[PDB]
């Protein structure tokens, strides 16, 4: 249904060890599709998904120029942030930026984003109106006045409403065999005795895409959300994801427990039970 395009950027200064490290990656939904690393041999933006390789060399030239320019801007901005926060030149600091757009099933803009962070904390963010700013502190208010004077929000709005949406739709069409394919979870339940009295039931979901999933345990149709241990959804390494949910159960009572799986790749939700 709904889709997103995001570009992520990290610059990390390293005083005494050369210029800051700069790494940026682009995502459509949960799929990484481009990458640039300043520390790589002859840095260029590189493809990481098959559907983006069909773009011509002028695409990769422009992308690489933009990345190199961002790395340069970050070097200057990191020096400025030292002044804004009365910091010494000896420490390592981190500058992060994300921007992108969400589009709905009808292919129109749902929301645009552009936000920056310094040393892991919010610095300045474009508001949902794509016309105003939220500054985190008095330093970021200095940036906010500069950006209001230079009409930065109007420049971002043009991109987020226009190019961001148009190029996302292009990618979704060229990558439709993967980006518009939901892979359903392969599911099973395993049984792990703790003692003579109790056992862990673990409900597994493997090999699904996209990462969004809901796993819950029920006993006689009552949600055991209080007693369920969930792991964070984790990448399998092959584009797909994994997750499990576990409950501790009185031995001999396993058949009272059902695991419920919801994912966009499934016709209808699944219910599983432990099978001896």
């Amino acid at each position: 249904g709904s889709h997103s395009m995001r570009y992520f950027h990290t610059s990390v200064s390293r005083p005494g060890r050369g210029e800051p490290r700069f790494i940026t990656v682009g995502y459509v939904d949960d799929t990484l599709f481009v990458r640039f690393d300043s520390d790589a041999a002859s840095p260029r933006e590189e493809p990481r998904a098959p559907w983006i390789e069909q773009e011509g060399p002028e695409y990769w030239d422009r992308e690489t120029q933009i990345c190199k320019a961002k790395a340069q801007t970050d070097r200057e901005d990191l020096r400025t942030l030292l002044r804004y926060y009365n910091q010494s030149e000896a420490g390592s600091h981190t500058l992060q930026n994300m921007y992108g757009c969400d589009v709905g099933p009808d292919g129109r803009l749902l929301r645009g984003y552009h936000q920056d962070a310094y040393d892991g904390k919010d610095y300045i963010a474009l508001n949902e109106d794509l016309s105003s700013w939220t500054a985190a502190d008095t330093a970021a208010q200095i940036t906010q006045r500069k950006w209001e004077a230079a009409r930065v929000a109007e420049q971002l709005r043009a991109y987020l409403e226009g190019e961001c949406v148009e190029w996302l739709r292009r990618y979704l069409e060229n990558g439709k065999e993967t980006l518009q394919r939901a892979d359903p979870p392969k599911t099973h339940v395993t049984h792990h005795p703790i003692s003579d009295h109790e056992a862990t039931l673990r409900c597994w979901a493997l090999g699904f895409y996209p990462a969004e999933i809901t796993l819950t345990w029920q006993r006689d149709g009552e949600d055991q959300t209080q007693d369920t241990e969930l792991v964070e959804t984790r990448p399998a390494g092959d584009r797909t994801f994994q997750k499990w949910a576990a409950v501790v159960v009185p031995s001999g009572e396993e058949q009272r427990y059902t695991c419920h799986v919801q994912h966009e790749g499934l016709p209808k939700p699944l219910t599983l039970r432990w099978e001896p």
């Binding site: 901005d77 950006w147 230079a150 991109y159 190019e163």
Partner: peptide
């Protein structure tokens, strides 16, 4: 595709 960043902090 990416947006040119043309502003400083």
């Amino acid at each position: 595709r990416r947006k040119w960043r043309r502003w400083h902090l």
